[PDB]
Amino acid sequence: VPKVTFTVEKGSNEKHLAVLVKYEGDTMAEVELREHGSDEWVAMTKGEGGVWTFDSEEPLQGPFNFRFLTEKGMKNVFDDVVPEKYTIGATYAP
């Protein structure tokens, strides 16, 4: 199995993405998300169980790029891992 997987949780909708960011061997300290084609990185709220959501006041344009800081100081970037046509429950791994 991969080390970093991005699972789209139940409740996601066009104006509300909810992702289960897992990194075997570490924990997320903060996860930012940049929409497709924007140069802006928005912060994501730490929901619980390790789910980071984001409530956009406009719909969200995929594919999505995620960037995180782990509790161990690991800071990686992943461009486009959750496509525009993501299916819920589905796990996306680079």
UniProtKB/Swiss-Prot annotation:
Main localisation, per the record? secreted
Alphabetized UniProt keyword annotations = Allergen, Secreted, Signal
The record's Gene Ontology biological-process terms are: plant-type cell wall loosening
Query: Is Protein biosynthesis given among the entry's keywords?
Result: no
Q: In which tissues is it expressed?
A: Pollen specific.
Q: Which family does it belong to?
A: Belongs to the expansin family. Expansin B subfamily.
Q: What is this protein called?
A: Pollen allergen Phl p 2
Q: Which residues of the full protein are shown?
A: 27 to 120 of 122
